[PDB]
Amino acid sequence: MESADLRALAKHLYDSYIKSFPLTKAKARAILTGKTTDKSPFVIYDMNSLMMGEDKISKEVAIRIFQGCQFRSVEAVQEITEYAKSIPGFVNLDLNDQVTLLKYGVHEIIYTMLASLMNKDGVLISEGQGFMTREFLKSLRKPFGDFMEPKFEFAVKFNALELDDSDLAIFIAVIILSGDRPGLLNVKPIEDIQDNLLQALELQLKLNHPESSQLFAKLLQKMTDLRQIVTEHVQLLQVIKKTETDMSLHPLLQEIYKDL
Amino acid sequence: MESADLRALAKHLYDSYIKSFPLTKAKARAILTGKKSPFVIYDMNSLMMGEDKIKFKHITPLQEQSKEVAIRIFQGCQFRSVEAVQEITEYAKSIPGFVNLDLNDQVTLLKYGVHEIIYTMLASLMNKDGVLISEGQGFMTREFLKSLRKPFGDFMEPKFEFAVKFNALELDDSDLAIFIAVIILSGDRPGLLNVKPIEDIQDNLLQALELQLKLNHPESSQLFAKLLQKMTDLRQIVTEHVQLLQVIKKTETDMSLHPLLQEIYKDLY
Numbered sequence: 184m185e186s187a188d189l190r191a192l193a194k195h196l197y198d199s200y201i202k203s204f205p206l207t208k209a210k211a212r213a214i215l216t217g218k219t220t221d222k223s224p225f226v227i228y229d230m231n232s233l234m235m236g237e238d239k240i241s242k243e244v245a246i247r248i249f250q251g252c253q254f255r256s257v258e259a260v261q262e263i264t265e266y267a268k269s270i271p272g273f274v275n276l277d278l279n280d281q282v283t284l285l286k287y288g289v290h291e292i293i294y295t296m297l298a299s300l301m302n303k304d305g306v307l308i309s310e311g312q313g314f315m316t317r318e319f320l321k322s323l324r325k326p327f328g329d330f331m332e333p334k335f336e337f338a339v340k341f342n343a344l345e346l347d348d349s350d351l352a353i354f355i356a357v358i359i360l361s362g363d364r365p366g367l368l369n370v371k372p373i374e375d376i377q378d379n380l381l382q383a384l385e386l387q388l389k390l391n392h393p394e395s396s397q398l399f400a401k402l403l404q405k406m407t408d409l410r411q412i413v414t415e416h417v418q419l420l421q422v423i424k425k426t427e428t429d430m431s432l433h434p435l436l437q438e439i440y441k442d443l
Numbered sequence: 444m445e446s447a448d449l450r451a452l453a454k455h456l457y458d459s460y461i462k463s464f465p466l467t468k469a470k471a472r473a474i475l476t477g478k479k480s481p482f483v484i485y486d487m488n489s490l491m492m493g494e495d496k497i498k499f500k501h502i503t504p505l506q507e508q509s510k511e512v513a514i515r516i517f518q519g520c521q522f523r524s525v526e527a528v529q530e531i532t533e534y535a536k537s538i539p540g541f542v543n544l545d546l547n548d549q550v551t552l553l554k555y556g557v558h559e560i561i562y563t564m565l566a567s568l569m570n571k572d573g574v575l576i577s578e579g580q581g582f583m584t585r586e587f588l589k590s591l592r593k594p595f596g597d598f599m600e601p602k603f604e605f606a607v608k609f610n611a612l613e614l615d616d617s618d619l620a621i622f623i624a625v626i627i628l629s630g631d632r633p634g635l636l637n638v639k640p641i642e643d644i645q646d647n648l649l650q651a652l653e654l655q656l657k658l659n660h661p662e663s664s665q666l667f668a669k670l671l672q673k674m675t676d677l678r679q680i681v682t683e684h685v686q687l688l689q690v691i692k693k694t695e696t697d698m699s700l701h702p703l704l705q706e707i708y709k710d711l712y
């Protein structure tokens with residue numbers, strides 16, 4: 184609750200975030216804007232560029248891309264879980280509430296952090312080694328094309344806030360420590376942690392974006408749109424599963440989606 | 444370098460050690476010796492009453508957990524160990540020079556060090572008759588732990604065997620604060636990128652521990668050497684520990700936790 188303490192918490196979370204997520208927004212942005220020789224991605228914009236891309240960096244292409252999304256989402260769940268344990272107080276919570284917070288929080292976080300990998304033309308893949316175009320993703324057949332596009336729609340709006348990794352590290356923590364998740368046993372300790380995270384985010388945004396009016400409020404308003412987009416994602420994903428048999432969901436994602 | 448620098452480092456680490464860990468050795472020993480009473484778990488019925496009266500957070504039934512007591516206690520060890528890792532990680536940041544290391548090397552040092560540190564610090568909570576749990580609110584007997592069925596009983600006992608020998612050195616919290624730092628700053632962990640600064644810090648921690656032990660146990664002959672020799676018992680039992688855990692997972696079908704819980708505890712299983 185004191186500034187030094189709030190700045191210390193910000194530094195802690197940023198450092199843990201760097202340790203936990205291999206591909207930061209800062210690195211993604213350097214790749215997307217370029218001007219460098221060594222970091223240029225191979226761009227996948229059609230079927231044949233995809234073929235060449237596998238040789239550089241079976242199933243029907245839409246499915247293969249879906250399985251690529253879910254395999255990375257599972258890895259992201261693992262990275263997010265490691266990050267969560269570094270949030271002060273999280274591992275001391277009731278073990279059931281830890282599961283619950285991760286269960287309902289990972290999806291919102293994956294959307295947030297996916298945006299870091301995206302611009303209006305596509306998304307970085309394979310640790311930034313590839314770039315798959317939005318138009319290619321959107322043109323995937325039957326339900327898959329429309330499954331991909333809303334991730335871009337959110338990302339373009341979220342990215343206009345110009346958050347950097349130091350901002351995102353605290354924002355992600357706030358999302359995880361949401362006391363309103365269904366089935367929480369002890370709301371008060373989660374809310375006490377979140378108030379400290381919210382206080383730290385508030386000061387971080389004031390110091391890092393002093394010219395950005397009410398960025399704190401605008402970012403909390405983004406957490407609202409995240410709740411709606413994750414809801415649409417699950418409903419669409421359920422429909423796809425009840426139509427496509429060639430789709431396995433990783434048992435970790437399978438568990439997260441059950442009862443959700 | 445100089446005596447004052449080494450004493451300052453000792454005091455800095457001691458002060459941080461107190462801040463980082465919930466139950467110090469000094470407080471634990473007062474409880475173990477009877478100097479009010481912790482709730483005592485000595486059999487199945489006292490365990491049931493103890494979880495119902497006291498809230499032993501690591502041995503409370505989860506959803507999708509084994510109801511078998513031996514498994515529940517085993518997993519409780521793993522859940523507390525997860526908590527200890529974060530405590531050790533926070534302590535590490537207070538060691539002068541540590542946060543300036545390469546971030547990958549900070550991660551590596553903590554990764555390969557926490558097991559040795561958890562064993563070491565567990566000894567502070569243990570005597571030959573049992574172990575303090577829940578910040579000293581409970582005391583679980585060695586006989587109860589050792590009498591758990593199949594491999595679980597034999598998984599518990601080696602921890603007591605080590606602790607009893609380690610505790611004969613009669614280290615206090617000011618000694619342990621430096622010793623634990625020395626363990627973290629081990630230059631021989633696999634995959635370190637820049638060993639030189641890690642050994643430079645460890646050499647300072649070693650000088651500080653050597654002087655600490657001379658001043659705090661002037662009558663304890665070659666205590667510095669005997670404590671470094673305990674790295675032999677520590678490296679060996681962590682090795683044994685890994686083999687034991689493997690047998691349990693490749694044998695026990697009733698160990699299922701919610702996959703998100705499995706992910707949280709993934710480095711300790």
Ligand SMILES: O=C(O)c1ccc(-c2nn(C(=O)c3c(Cl)cccc3C(F)(F)F)c3ccc(Cl)cc23)c(OCC2CCCCC2)c1
Nearest residue numbers: 248251252253255256259290293294297306308315331334
């Ligand atoms: O690296 C990451 O951090 C990363 C993170 C996320 C995705 C991703 N997840 N995702 C989902 O639907 C999804 C979500 Cl958001 C949350 C949870 C579960 C899922 C799902 F299980 F259902 F999969 C996308 C849809 C559209 C798009 Cl463009 C991306 C995703 C991701 O994409 C990897 C590559 C996409 C292009 C082809 C090659 C692989 C990468």
Ligand SMILES: O=C(O)c1ccc(-c2nn(C(=O)c3c(Cl)cccc3C(F)(F)F)c3ccc(Cl)cc23)c(OCC2CCCCC2)c1
Nearest residue numbers: 501519520521523524527558561562565574576599602711
């Ligand atoms: O408070 C602490 O600082 C504390 C510290 C350690 C333990 C502990 N760790 N441990 C391990 O096996 C272990 C080790 Cl040493 C190193 C690394 C990882 C593990 C493991 F992940 F595999 F778990 C025990 C075995 C036997 C016994 Cl008696 C204890 C431990 C500890 O136990 C708490 C339990 C509460 C419920 C009732 C039973 C004791 C508490």
